Design a binder for this molecule. Structure first.
Ligand SMILES: COc1ccc(-c2cc3n[nH]c(C4CC4)c3n(-c3ccc(OC(F)F)cc3)c2=O)cc1
Ligand SMILES: COc1ccc(-c2cc3n[nH]c(C4CC4)c3n(-c3ccc(OC(F)F)cc3)c2=O)cc1
Ligand SMILES: C[S@@+](CC[C@H](N)C(=O)[O-])C[C@H]1O[C@@H](n2cnc3c(N)ncnc32)[C@H](O)[C@@H]1O
Ligand SMILES: C[S@@+](CC[C@H](N)C(=O)[O-])C[C@H]1O[C@@H](n2cnc3c(N)ncnc32)[C@H](O)[C@@H]1O
Lengths: 381, 381
């Protein structure tokens, strides 16, 4: 009684959707390195032997798309036809046009930076939970770390049969605690990872338990009842884009909170700061994390929304799950006094012209590496 | 006190992401019309002058992709270069391969239908709320209806300056009611819609208020304080794929609950029943709606999760927001006694080999047209 299960998933750097997010952000970073004010909306599609870039970019940068794309794929680890994909020999197709002048005139042309309009309408959420130091759900943190461990053991040659495409899934049993949640145990773990033709299934399952799970998940969460689904399909030689077409912005729940909190639907990768799908979601995370680290709540959800061409948010809402002594009205007043959620101010607070976006495009955008949206603001009230 | 704001958005049939969802589902339906057991994973990408199909299909059907794609675009209304896109003259490119034999062997080959494995791992949620008869949030229902009204007035020639690409957004002020929610008033409406070169902004704004909003939103929700952002960008002549690249599965929150409830990240369109991203989300909606229509709760969230190759869900969770006299344990027991959430049983209960998918791909998958997942199951307990 008073317990429940929750499941989250994550994917590796070579999962085809994640390849697309990383390439889209490599293109964004390449532009920002030369033109901090580049307007970028770069979608990527990946299928057998193909990376296609489709979208809209208006920028003063001179970017070599062939080189940027191939370097991103090389970093991921797809460097030979035996692995199903090779940066040296794949097709890179480009269908990029300028930003629509109708959007440009309605959003940013002849506007003071602080007063630029939102680049689109939409809704966005921020979330934070005190269950981990990084203020993230344990389910998603563990799922990301399992993928990172696979990449580590692939890159260091420990498990040379590993290939870049992987997925993980973690189910945790939680105890309810006055609106907050306390992890009790890991109920189920799934790991699927692309592999070479020579390794056998038993060798893989043993290595995934001993060298991956045990190296990531604290033993205190694992018990005799924990269920393991390791290589459950039985064979995963074909992988990457060859096994499944990838697209940018198809892992938006992996990118955020693993299903916890809420999501407004917008993808992050391949977009400059004027696209509030990314900047306002980062600012909302920053607000939520600041409320938790500031001791005002233990668990909190923030919604914001925008209209294209309008700078100020249309709506702001805060839900504290019963974990604050302050009302929603009081928390909203604190947020109003401490944050300015116009995109032209978020860009300054979070330094969103800096070319750090490729680093966000795998293992989640939140709870890692002290990015600006992860450094809480000291609140005055 | 005790009130809060919530915002949801919707998009029209000609929004580029939605074009892709509709084409992906037109391809799925074309296959299912000839082969009820087709394995389909069809992604679509749209940019100026281009529809690209990328993915994996194993099927006995003989499908004319050129015809299926062009007919879907014609239905949407993109039939002339003056509108930015034309089904008669666009490029249709196909990058479709068979389903990976490694996936096929791990999921469905030599398996009894009821015992087919999930086509992938993942998590999915279902949600229902008694605030409307259709058990959907008012924010998303109104946002969808505003887009449908635009399409209606475009097609009937009432507002011949309208083009197919549109977005809407509705913010409602709600009253808290013992875990359930009661709509009070519409706080803000956004409408952006592509238009011809001849109509002026004032004519559009007047028509959007008088012929669109007033024809959809009950007057009791609108007052002197309601904020209207109508054509807020000021100009939207360039639109459809020309204005913004579209991809399948980039409107997953529009497709579901408009941000309410929760989402596991999986896209619906272009996928056959074995892909639990779609079938298990439909079954979870069916469960949630059955719990609300059965009088067991007023508002409910259901999470399920799967592992590739495994038939039974790995986890099931139910959260009733404090709106049931039964505990989560009791509701879980009722669900266990009444539903079988293996994909090979969901297919039978929800008739998921039927080619009705293109109809789901605009205006939301839930709360409309008495699809099987919208017809509550009579619960025995
Ligand atoms: C009295 O203290 C409490 C009381 C309750 C709960 C809690 C219980 C619970 N049972 N099933 C779920 C969800 C998986 C279905 C629960 N959720 C919950 C609700 C929403 C979430 O985010 C997003 F999915 F919307 C995540 C978890 C709780 O919050 C927690 C603390
Ligand atoms: C005592 O009865 C109640 C008590 C509280 C609330 C309620 C208040 C509330 N203030 N802000 C929000 C969210 C926009 C931030 C609220 N939410 C809420 C929470 C989660 C939702 O779904 C998804 F976003 F996760 C949707 C709405 C409530 O549920 C409702 C009824
Ligand atoms: C299972 S595939 C999605 C379904 C696929 N489009 C189809 O044609 O059935 C989704 C993801 O699962 C992983 N995957 C691919 N092949 C797999 C296999 N043989 N076993 C397990 N997971 C696999 C990859 O990460 C891939 O991007
Ligand atoms: C604003 S665009 C996204 C940003 C875009 N990729 C860019 O290059 O800035 C997203 C959606 O908004 C709508 N849209 C396109 N042009 C618009 C305009 N001029 N005014 C308002 N909405 C527009 C279309 O529905 C489009 O799919």
């Amino acid at each position: 009684e008073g317990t429940f299960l929750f499941t989250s998933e994550s994917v590796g750097e070579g999962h085809p959707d994640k390849i697309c997010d990383q390439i889209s952000d490599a293109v964004l970073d390449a532009h920002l390195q030369q033109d901090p004010d580049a307007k970028v909306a770069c979608e990527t599609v990946a299928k057998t032997g193909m990376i296609l870039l489709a979208g809209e970019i208006t920028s003063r940068a001179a970017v070599d798309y062939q080189k940027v794309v191939r370097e991103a794929v090389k970093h991921i680890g797809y460097d030979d036809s035996s692995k199903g994909f090779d940066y040296k020999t794949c097709n890179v197709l480009v269908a990029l046009e300028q930003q629509s002048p109708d959007i440009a005139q309605g959003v940013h042309l002849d506007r003071n930076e602080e007063d630029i309009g939102a680049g689109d309408q939409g809704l966005m959420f921020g979330y934070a939970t005190d269950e981990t130091e990084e203020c993230m759900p344990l389910t998603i943190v563990l799922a990301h770390k399992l993928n990172a461990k696979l990449a580590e053991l692939r890159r260091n040659g420990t498990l040379p049969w590993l290939r870049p495409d992987s997925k993980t899934q973690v189910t945790v049993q939680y105890m309810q605690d006055r609106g907050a949640v306390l992890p009790i145990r890991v109920h189920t773990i799934v790991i699927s990872v692309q592999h070479d033709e020579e390794v056998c299934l038993d060798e893989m399952r043993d290595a995934l338990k001993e060298k991956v799970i045990k190296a990531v998940v604290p033993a205190k969460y694992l018990d005799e009842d924990t269920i393991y689904h390791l290589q459950p399909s039985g064979r995963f030689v074909i992988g990457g884009p060859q096994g499944d077409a990838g697209l940018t912005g198809r892992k938006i729940i992996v990118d955020t909170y693993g299903g916890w909190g809420a999501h407004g639907g917008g993808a992050f990768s391949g977009k400059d700061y004027t696209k509030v799908d990314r900047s306002a979601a980062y600012a909302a995370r920053w607000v939520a994390k600041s409320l938790v680290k500031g001791g005002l709540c233990r668990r909190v959800l923030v919604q914001v929304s925008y209209a294209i061409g309008v700078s100020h948010p249309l709506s702001i809402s805060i839900f504290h799950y019963g974990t604050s002594q302050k009302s929603e009205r009081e928390l909203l007043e604190i947020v109003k006094k401490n944050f300015d959620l116009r995109p032209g101010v978020i860009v300054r607070d979070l330094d969103l012209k800096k070319p750090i976006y490729q680093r966000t495009a795998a293992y989640g955008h939140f709870g890692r590496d002290s990015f600006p949206w992860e450094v809480p603001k000291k609140l005055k009230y």
